[PDB]
Write a protein that binds this DNA or RNA. Structure first.
Ligand SMILES: [Mg+2]
Lengths: 59, 126, 59
RNA sequence: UGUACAACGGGGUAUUGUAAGCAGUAGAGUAGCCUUGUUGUUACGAUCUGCUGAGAUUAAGCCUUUGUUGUCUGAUUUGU
RNA sequence: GAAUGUUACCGCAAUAGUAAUUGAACUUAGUACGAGAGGAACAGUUCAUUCGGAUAAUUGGUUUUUGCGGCUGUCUGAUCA
RNA sequence: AUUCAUAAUAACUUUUCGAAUCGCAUGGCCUUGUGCUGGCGAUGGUUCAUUCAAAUUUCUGCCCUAUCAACUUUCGAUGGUA
RNA sequence: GAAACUGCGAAUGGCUCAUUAAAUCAGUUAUCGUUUAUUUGAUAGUUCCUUUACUACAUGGUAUAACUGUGGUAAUUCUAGA
């Protein structure tokens, strides 16, 4: 039986990776897939205007 | 009614059986018999007396109580949402490892743009 | 007492306050890290198995 | 001549505190050997560990017994 | 313990003796009484003092259980005992 | 003034350090590749010297008391070897 | 640009004079008897380990904070689990 508050729900991992090889194993890509485009972004709406503020890639 | 434990021998004390000794440091020892009371007053150590639970623990006699624990071997089994990932589309992008020649296709346009910008800057300097 | 139960797979967690002392007597004389089946404490937790991670005493 | 009695034995309960013997790559160290080393073995060595909450004792005013072995007609006296 | 017919069981009860004692706390009530200061009592409850009769589950004491272990000195060739 | 500095041989170390770091400028060479080179700094780092110091240390030097004249050395007191 | 990790600093300063009579201290010597963050200036071509596929060097790996959320206690610059 599924408990009302635990298995009914699922919460998101608040942040995504920042290191390159961490991304590359997160998506299992390659030594060469150019991680810069596989970046997780988070579109916010400060007002009507929006922006994504993708973090960085260290290393 | 509680069943207290002997402070020297680990025996079980039933009500109305044995004695209690309050030491000057306000510690309470409980004895099931004059034997263990006397050995306490003779200030012997129960880890050296062979009939005591403490000795038997220290020497591993009747040691079938706890054996061991396992080691964890298993996956995560949850690609949970990264809160800006949209896990379904994130998996759709994870399967997008093939057809990665679009990466070089975009690198070609970036090379064209960087070279045009270099030429533009070299011309603007003049 | 109370149980702060957590399902790390979905990543969620919930409190459950508990009475019926002869249900929680199962936890007694157990260590942290040990496993317990939940039907002995509640058949709402039937077929589950929990692992004890910590706790906080009175005071 | 029988849910008889006794002596033994067994079991339980209790008391003590882990028997003797064997073994040990345990052991403060010491001497000797040579295959001369690569734990080298031999001997001496309080003690420790294991077989071992073991052994011993347990009714003489403890408990119980499907056990074994036995015993079970001697003498005196008494009458409204 | 002889004798009362013997023997056994269950009993009666003349006579004699006689045993229970004292106090505190709470409550009564800071009430009654009294100008006030002060300050009760009966009933009830819980405990205790002195005495007495039993008992030994527990605690304690006692130990020739010479029961178990340990220690000394010597004797049994050493060991075991 | 040295068994100083330094160097050289023999090996030893559970093995030290020898840049996976950051910013601005973005320039030069071509066999035009995200090719090869390249500036001004920051930070970090072994050793040496230096500096800021520390630690110990030499010599001489301190008030009143003899109604304190002997003290230290048991177990550190004075020295020696390790 | 809050928070938090990291690095530094917090051993300075300021207060007081209880101790302390060759002790501190003063001036004068020494370290050929040693430590020294920081500064300042100099200074590592040598490290692929059967070192001919053993290797990522256009550069390797894992945690964990802050953060999200669930809580404990009367209470503290308390804190657990995920
Ligand atoms: Mg420097």
């Amino acid at each position: 039986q599924e408990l009302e508050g635990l298995t009914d729900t699922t919460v998101p991992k608040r942040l995504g990776p920042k290191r390159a090889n961490n991304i590359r194993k997160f998506f299992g890509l390659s030594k060469e897939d150019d991680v810069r485009d596989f970046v997780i972004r988070r579109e916010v709406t400060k007002g009507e205007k929006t922006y994504t503020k993708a973090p960085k890639i260290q290393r | 009614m509680k069943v207290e434990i002997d402070s020297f021998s680990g025996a079980k004390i039933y009500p109305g059986r044995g004695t209690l000794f309050v030491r000057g440091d306000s510690k309470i020892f409980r004895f099931q018999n004059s034997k263990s009371a006397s050995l306490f007053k003779q200030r012997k150590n129960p880890r050296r007396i062979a009939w005591t639970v403490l000795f038997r623990k220290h020497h591993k006699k009747g040691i079938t109580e706890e054996v061991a624990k396992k080691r964890s071997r298993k996956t995560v089994k949850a690609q949970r949402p990264i809160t800006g990932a949209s896990l379904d589309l994130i998996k759709e992008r994870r399967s997008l490892k093939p057809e990665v020649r679009k990466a070089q296709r975009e690198e070609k346009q970036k090379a064209d743009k960087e070279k045009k910008k270099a030429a533009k800057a070299a011309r603007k300097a003049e | 007492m109370k149980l702060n139960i957590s399902y790390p797979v979905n990543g969620s967690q919930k409190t459950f306050e508990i009475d019926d002392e002869h249900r929680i007597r199962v936890f007694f004389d157990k260590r942290i890290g040990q496993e317990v089946d939940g039907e002995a404490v509640g058949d709402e937790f039937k077929g589950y198995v929990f692992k004890i991670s910590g706790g906080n005493d009175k005071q």
